[PDB]
Design a protein around this nucleic acid. Structure first.
Lengths: 104, 73, 84
RNA sequence: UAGACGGUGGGAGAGGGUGGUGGAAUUCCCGGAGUAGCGGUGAAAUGCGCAGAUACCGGGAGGAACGCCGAUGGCGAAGGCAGCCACCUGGUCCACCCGUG
RNA sequence: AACUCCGUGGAAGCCGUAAUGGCAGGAAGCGGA
RNA sequence: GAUGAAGCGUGCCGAAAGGCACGUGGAA
């Protein structure tokens, strides 16, 4: 009121990694926004200052929904010897998932 | 580290110079972005080589035990 | 009753998180959150001992798997940063 | 699958770490009222007190510990751990017998 | 030439140095100021 | 001209911690 929720995020994007359209990275996202192709924009919590405000304006100008997370690695594996990190992701693609629906 | 001092100055003096300077030279996590790219620019002056953010911090550490108490209070 | 075809239907949708080597991954999740806990709280020696033993057990499972297969102990030895 | 591990669901606890915070008491300082002693011992003395102590009321500052509950109790691998609050976190028991084998 | 920068391009391990280093907040390459 | 500190790299080892070797780097 629940037991850990917690991180149904983590497993949610976990699938995307194998399922598929979508794009990662700042530039490509800013591009997706301007092109108006993006559907949703997920931003990592820490994410740099004014580096986030950018994605914010163009998300506004492009009328793109912004779901504040973010980003990282399959933490457990790359932790050990493993992440790459991601400060933002752009749903031009979710497939067998549903993070798009009622969640940001 | 303290190796530049040769056999001079004694244990405590150079053990502390190494201790202070090792911490000093450690990777530091920038306050603005979150990247570990903060380097001392002058004692108490810190800067991130990634985004350029120039901060006021401790003399040999970006954060002091007292500067942390501030954030709370 | 409920036949294997219609069962795997359900499995594929939700791909299946219901249980199991799971064991390794679950403990990675334990380890990760414990490590983060102990990133602060540097003085908690007692639960740190529990970390040491988590990491140990993880390795033994990995080594187990690697052995009792030549395919899974590949990944396992590497993801544990174990061996040399 | 009879050991071990995992899952779902119940549980107790001074287990650990960080921040906060409550009241009692001691000391000091301030104000008030108030005199000739207070303290201490087997007896004493040193000591403190008329620049006013002790006893009494009010205000403040600071540090340390956490009465009752408290146990013949609980937790932890040991060392050890007890005001309350939140966050972070370890261990552990039970039921179902569901998963690995 | 170096440095800085623009476009393109789209690297999730690759580019680079005597050495440090650089990158999806986009690397190399190509084309420019 | 000599010696060759921190830092960094590569290799190997370890679950991690880190450790070892070699190189690089050049401090005083």
């Amino acid at each position: 009121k629940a037991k850990k929720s917690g991180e149904n995020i983590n497993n949610k994007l976990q699938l995307v990694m194998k399922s598929g359209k979508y794009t990662l990275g700042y530039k490509t996202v800013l591009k997706t926004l301007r092109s108006s192709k993006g559907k949703l924009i997920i931003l990592a919590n820490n994410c740099p200052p004014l580096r986030k405000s950018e994605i914010e304006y163009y998300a506004m100008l492009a009328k793109i929904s912004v779901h504040h997370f973010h980003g990282n690695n399959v933490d457990l594996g790359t932790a050990c010897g493993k992440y790459y990190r991601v400060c933002c992701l752009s749903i031009l693609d979710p497939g067998d998932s549903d993070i798009i629906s009622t969640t940001t | 580290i303290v190796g530049k001092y040769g056999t001079r100055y004694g244990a405590s003096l150079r053990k502390q110079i190494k201790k202070m300077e090792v911490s000093q030279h450690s990777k530091y996590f920038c306050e603005f972005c979150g990247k570990f790219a903060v380097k001392r620019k002058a004692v108490g002056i810190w800067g991130c080589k990634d985004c350029g953010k120039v901060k006021a911090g401790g003399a040999y550490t970006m954060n002091t035990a007292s500067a942390v108490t501030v954030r709370s209070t | 009753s409920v036949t294997g075809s219609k069962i795997l239907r359900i499995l594929k949708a939700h791909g299946l998180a219901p249980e199991i080597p799971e064991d390794l991954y679950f403990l990675i999740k334990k380890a990760v959150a414990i490590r983060k806990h102990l990133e602060r709280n540097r003085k908690d020696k007692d639960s740190k001992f529990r970390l040491i033993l988590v990491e140990s057990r993880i390795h033994r499972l990995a080594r187990y798997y690697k052995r009792t297969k030549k395919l899974p102990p590949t990944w396992k030895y590497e993801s544990t940063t174990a061996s040399t």
